Symmetry: D2
Subunit: 258 residues, 4 copies
Amino acid sequence: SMDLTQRLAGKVAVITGGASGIGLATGRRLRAEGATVVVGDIDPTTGKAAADELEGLFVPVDVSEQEAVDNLFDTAASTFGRVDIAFNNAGISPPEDDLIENTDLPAWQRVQDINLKSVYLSCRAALRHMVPAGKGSIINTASFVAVMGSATSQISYTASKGGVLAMSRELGVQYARQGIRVNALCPGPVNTPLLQELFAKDPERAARRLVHIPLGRFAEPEELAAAVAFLASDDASFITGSTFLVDGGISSAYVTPL
Amino acid sequence: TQRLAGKVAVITGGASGIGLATGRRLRAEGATVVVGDIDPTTGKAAADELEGLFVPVDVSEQEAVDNLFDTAASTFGRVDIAFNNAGISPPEDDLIENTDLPAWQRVQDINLKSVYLSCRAALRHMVPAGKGSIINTASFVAVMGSATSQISYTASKGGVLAMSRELGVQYARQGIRVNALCPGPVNTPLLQELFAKDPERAARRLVHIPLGRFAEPEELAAAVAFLASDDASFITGSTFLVDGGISSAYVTPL
Amino acid sequence: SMDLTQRLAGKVAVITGGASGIGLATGRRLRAEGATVVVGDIDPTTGKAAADELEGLFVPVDVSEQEAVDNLFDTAASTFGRVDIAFNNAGISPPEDDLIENTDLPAWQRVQDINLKSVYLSCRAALRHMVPAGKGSIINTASFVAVMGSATSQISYTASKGGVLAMSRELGVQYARQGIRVNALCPGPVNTPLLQELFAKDPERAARRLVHIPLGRFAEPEELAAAVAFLASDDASFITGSTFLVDGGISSAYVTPL
Amino acid sequence: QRLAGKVAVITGGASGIGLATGRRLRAEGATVVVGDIDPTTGKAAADELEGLFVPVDVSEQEAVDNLFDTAASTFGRVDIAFNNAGISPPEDDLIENTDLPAWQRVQDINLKSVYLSCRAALRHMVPAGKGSIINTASFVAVMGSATSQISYTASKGGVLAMSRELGVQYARQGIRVNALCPGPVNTPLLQELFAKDPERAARRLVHIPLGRFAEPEELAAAVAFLASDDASFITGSTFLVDGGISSAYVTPL
Ligand SMILES: NC(=O)c1ccc[n+]([C@@H]2O[C@H](COP(=O)([O-])OP(=O)(O)OC[C@H]3O[C@@H](n4cnc5c(N)ncnc54)[C@H](O)[C@@H]3O)[C@@H](O)[C@H]2O)c1
Ligand SMILES: NC(=O)c1ccc[n+]([C@@H]2O[C@H](COP(=O)([O-])OP(=O)(O)OC[C@H]3O[C@@H](n4cnc5c(N)ncnc54)[C@H](O)[C@@H]3O)[C@@H](O)[C@H]2O)c1
Ligand SMILES: NC(=O)c1ccc[n+]([C@@H]2O[C@H](COP(=O)([O-])OP(=O)(O)OC[C@H]3O[C@@H](n4cnc5c(N)ncnc54)[C@H](O)[C@@H]3O)[C@@H](O)[C@H]2O)c1
Ligand SMILES: NC(=O)c1ccc[n+]([C@@H]2O[C@H](COP(=O)([O-])OP(=O)(O)OC[C@H]3O[C@@H](n4cnc5c(N)ncnc54)[C@H](O)[C@@H]3O)[C@@H](O)[C@H]2O)c1
Ligand SMILES: [Mg+2]
Ligand SMILES: [Mg+2]
Ligand SMILES: [Mg+2]
Ligand SMILES: [Mg+2]
Ligand SMILES: [Zn+2]
Ligand SMILES: [Zn+2]
């Protein structure tokens, strides 16, 4: 009776950072549930390729720029008449952003611009279309580091995601009687081919992290995709302002199982 | 369709409210539902509607909880999903000043002991299978306190939350996820009528709910289907709040 | 001009489980700040010894019994005039309560009786005195395990402390306009001479726990005593319903420092 | 005597919570360095506390470094840092009505400032092998509101997350880092305003179990606790002093 293949039928979803990682996994999952996907990404090559795969739309965007972000959402609304879903997901974690002791202001500010400012811009743009429409679901990518701190610190990254979480929560409360939901996706660490190789080459480094993850592994991007589809859908109609942790138990755990 | 195709789900308190709505939703995704309930009349009717199995149970008794899961497993071969959901909120459990020991203990027996029994029995079956999803019904009151207190109820749900979290951590490498469903207040035809005849009482609660309304049982059912499924494969030990923004809000929108 | 040796001058404090551990350390600290301490404990030998050291009063009590708990607080109020502070701290962690697979009902229920029912009884009794007096500060001992789960589980203990936390929070909210504050003390693991010897002999068992504690050690009971003195005092006048974590950073930490 | 001899740097120390905290730390024996943007009120606060005023814009790296370097060269060390400077300007409001200059200004003064202040404080505390840092976040880092100041809220969420991480990171170097999260704080201005507009007051107070805003002295008491050895097993804390706000559904009458 319940077919998930039409859960997002006819819904227009904008995804930033959509050409890779959880952004691309999410694009595939929303498309599989019937959504029309607008891929916004800084890379025109991988961006075009993603949109082609999803039978969707590519708009090039630097999410740290107000004009680019407005253009993304405005192009989406002009093309399809509406924006139903916004997955405000673009973010970076560059090597120059590290321990507070060795992280200088250019690194600090660049990460804020691309990770926190971008979410302010993206929410403002999405709301410009969603509010007069009387409906919408916004998912902002924060992180489990918005709730849990680490000795292996990337200090501007951590602050930016804390900012994303608190802003997401407030927006969710603010717009809760205007037909809109806003939620913060807080992923645990996410697996990549590069990490899989690195962890195999350095078991000590891997174990230093895995000992704090009850499930004993990083997330696959498809697992985050499943959560965004849930939040984007009417299955999450009573969920707004959420600290939506998909972290394999990290935030819940003291001593982990063997 | 068929996110839960072939899966066997045991639901306690499955004959009413969230339990019943969840039964319907899991069935719609392909699950076989075993309805465990103290009420044989509504229990049989729910199982008949879901094309499932009704099994009498008193969730406060070890023999009965063990028989519920044993019967589900012997009948269908396995228990994939346990929604340990049965609970009460009797009027004799109220403000701590007026709440006496019989009421205190009855609520602990039915709401907290029951989840220990149900998880112990579910795990007996799930651990050798190497897979399972357990959803325990706590409450948003495990996270938020209220002046309109039912004190044993609140303590029991805090206990459910903490135990759920720990079981989730403990079994995370044995293929079994454990999560605490924490609903906000749930709507009923009765509450809908009461709130209409008494807008002051309604407002006193609704002013703390951003969405401005109680949940529908179907909305909790949607969350349990998510948690029961592989869509939540990286979610365990969760304080899974489905509360319309209650735990997140200071000043609410008009 | 701030002298803490007078912060609780004349205040009457009832401490359950006052003969040992955190309870005893807290008695010393409250007394050092000028309080009159009523030591409620099941053990008359250590109970009397504590009250003698604290220049206070020992009152025998089984905190799992309504009559005994009512007698403890009624005796404190009759003997010293009032109950200003209640530190509802008595609790047990017996070995028969362990992993859920191996934990039978008598152990389950015994821990619920002594750890959770006891806090209901103790709060109900303290409030009988504090409400008419229009003032009071109640501190209930929960645990960091009310917030964080462990694979090394004592399942009834954990449930009991989750129950204590939620009840404390609700009581704190409920009585916030009646001159009373109620807060949950949530200690991390606390050190003992026994534990220090056990960890020295068994570095493996030790590191399995310490790797999740940013401070790198268990708490000393005096550190919890200092938190209770704060919560009992007017220095915590705007703190009620708190999940008051004194846990060396456990609930906050992913990867810990070396 | 709890803070006898300890040197405490307080940004925003010339008014509000910063000033109340200066008085409390002094009353426990601390030496207070008042870092503030206004020299006249700054010197006034320092003179009262028998401390030292250092002029500083906490959004400037060179000025923040000078603040902590001057504290260390004058009194030998920095034992306590209360990184408390922040603003809540009206230009920062609902997200629909908040432009980029307003957004960025609040991030600069509220969040960047805490990164700069922590970097400088830690640089001094690490050699000493001891120190206690208290960063002022807010209860809005934990609870959202429809009456939104969106950059402020974001900045304070950032302050909380960064405080938590630093507290974890430095926990085995004898340093503690904690986030003070105050509820709404009373002022004479607010007090008169809530009298003239009781409907406005009621809209907020119905979410506060204690039924009032905090007095700055109450926050000062919490900072003194965190600054002291009484909080030696507390680090990385979301230290809520919010009258029960983050804990409450239906509030008492
Ligand atoms: N361990 C993790 O990967 C992890 C964990 C938790 C949260 N997150 C967050 O999830 C989001 C994506 O994670 P991911 O693993 O998929 O990373 P990813 O590198 O695989 O994807 C990031 C995408 O964003 C694009 N992008 C980068 N800068 C951009 C800019 N200015 N404008 C527009 N697009 C830009 C990139 O081209 C890239 O396609 C990030 O916000 C990340 O911080 C990641
Ligand atoms: N506002 C809410 O309804 C709300 C909010 C949060 C959490 N919860 C919790 O959700 C769960 C379900 O709530 P609901 O409103 O749907 O309840 P409900 O009263 O509508 O139906 C629950 C079922 O539990 C059955 N039951 C009662 N005692 C039993 C026992 N000893 N053994 C076996 N079955 C028994 C009842 O016969 C009934 O069919 C409960 O645990 C509740 O505490 C409810
Ligand atoms: N690692 C830890 O020690 C730790 C951590 C977090 C929370 N806690 C909790 O802190 C509280 C105190 O812990 P502790 O380590 O200081 O205990 P303790 O064993 O060192 O002291 C025991 C005291 O409690 C008394 N007691 C036991 N049962 C009693 C009963 N029915 N009635 C009256 N008194 C009774 C004992 O006789 C004694 O007076 C407990 O509730 C504990 O669960 C402990
Ligand atoms: N309701 C509240 O007041 C409340 C609640 C929670 C958190 N907070 C936060 O507590 C902290 C202090 O609050 P307050 O009420 O005492 O504010 P306040 O306005 O009374 O004091 C702020 C001080 O900081 C100074 N200052 C401003 N900008 C500066 C700059 N660039 N560089 C150096 N100094 C500067 C000011 O001169 C002033 O003395 C702030 O961070 C605030 O956001 C306030
Ligand atoms: Mg990176
Ligand atoms: Mg009821
Ligand atoms: Mg023990
Ligand atoms: Mg302002
Ligand atoms: Zn850990
Ligand atoms: Zn509220």
